Point group: D2
Chain length 142, copies 4
């Protein structure tokens, strides 16, 4: 059993990103999302699965999906932005198990990642605890 | 644009079901989940899509996925229980758009649905507003 | 350090009670309220303090304040209903440290309590774990 | 009836402030706290009351209470930090109605306020809508 506990930081008062979706991939006995002490907690039944969070800023027509998981006993993460309306977290979560470019992101087993949207705003995941059963990450909205 | 506002009634202090997942299907320009005044609000960009909520009772090894949507401009719902660990909301939500036994439930455009798990616990969805752009439903856990 | 973890059960689809306020009394180094895995968690820095939750049903003009605490190393609880608009949780929480009838409720160190409003609806607190540092209770809305 | 909708911006991934308390003062027919689309919404029954939010960073031994209200039909705000353990939101909210150094802050009817704690961290409230029945404010944690 793994947990990934996520702290969300919204760093600029320009626009407002709100949570809109949280998904669980089906591998390794699946997993759950819990809110715990102001954090988003992804619990997974083993290595080889993941969960996604989608955030939307309707003020500025911006959005992103942040995905967190464990691949071969090492944590991984990715962010997808410039989302079409068809790119919900349900859709994006699954792409990490069949789409080569997404597969590669997972295989990278990154402790940190960033990507910018077409509007120039950057998003980042930073694992602050990178080892063990109880992993911790910052999700930073630029 | 459609909304479905959901009030959750957990009626029996035997076990405890907690929210663990909320998904959005990709059709009809997708959708979002919001928490508003203690209610779950599914917003959708048109007719032909849906969203799912999974709840889990860890104390009693119970779980269910409740799905809400609009099909051909009429609201629909379904509940799936007796879940395997591989049946996350991500999985179940998507099955309503390709799996015949799930497709048919969606096509029924039901204003109410009730089901029991193997342990005899009943789960129900009852729409209280069944027409118009802003729909309302009770989710009742027995 | 004590925690009291509270599971809220709303048992009838008649009206809808939503959370509106959560307060902490100042004794024993104060305390906090956290949402953890769908539960309300009151953490307190020792014996001799408490915290309150207020719920409101605007559909039916009903409300109540449920208070939980530890007095002389034994848990206690009370519910106040038939609230005036001036009876917020902030007000009610404090009354257990100066108002004789409220003082008495606290001194009772009850594992369970119930009270009905003028509309005939009953509310109950039931401690399921009554001893130790990590206490658990059901808040049942009739 | 007044509303104040609050967007929280936690801007620095050094420490983590989590919500721990939300209180309502008793004047002007009281009020409520709601979570709406990722925002905190304080609703009040008239002019002359307020509500408080306490946030705590356990990692860094930091905390603050942010208070929002309407005084003589104009919005007001204040932040208190460097809190003792006895200074819960319940305590602080009430002090704005009898304690001179707090009364004066309320009477200032400020559209913006900023303060630093002993460790040098800045906290700010900035109203984005300053007139009418439905007010809006950013709460910025530095
Ligand atoms: C150890 C590990 O991380 N393995 C993953 C593997 O996860 C496993 O998937 C199977 C079903 O395919 C099953 O759910 C099992 O419980 C999981 O541990 C992934 O399938 C692949 C991605 O293709 O990556 C690793 O091998
Ligand atoms: C109007 C309606 O309810 N139609 C649905 C249809 O939804 C549409 O799907 C397409 C993509 O196929 C697109 O997303 C469009 O925006 C939607 O309105 C569903 O595809 C089907 C599923 O069987 O059911 C109706 O025809
Ligand atoms: C052990 C216990 O429960 N004692 C309470 C007492 O709590 C204590 O209050 C003082 C300040 O008065 C201080 O905050 C200390 O940390 C607390 O443990 C209560 O004051 C009284 C109620 O009047 O009840 C017990 O004695
Ligand atoms: C209109 C206004 O803002 N007045 C406030 C006043 O609020 C009123 O308080 C009384 C009880 O004293 C009652 O609750 C009424 O509904 C409120 O409008 C405040 O009491 C004072 C605090 O100094 O400030 C103004 O006068």
């Amino acid at each position: 059993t793994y947990t990934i506990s996520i702290r969300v930081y919204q760093t600029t008062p320009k626009g407002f990103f709100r949570p809109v979706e949280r998904t669980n991939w089906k591998y390794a006995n699946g997993g759950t999302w819990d809110e715990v002490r102001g954090e988003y907690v992804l619990t997974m039944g083993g290595s080889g699965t993941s969960g996604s969070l989608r955030f939307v800023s309707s003020d500025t027509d911006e959005s992103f999906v942040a995905t967190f998981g464990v691949h071969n006993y090492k944590r991984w993460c990715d962010i997808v932005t410039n989302l079409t309306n068809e790119q919900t977290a349900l859709v994006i979560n699954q792409e990490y198990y069949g789409v080569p470019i997404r597969d590669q992101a997972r295989e990278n087993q990154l402790t940190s990642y960033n990507v910018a949207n077409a509007k120039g705003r950057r998003f980042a995941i930073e694992y602050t605890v990178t080892e063990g059963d109880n992993l911790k990450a910052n999700l930073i909205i630029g």
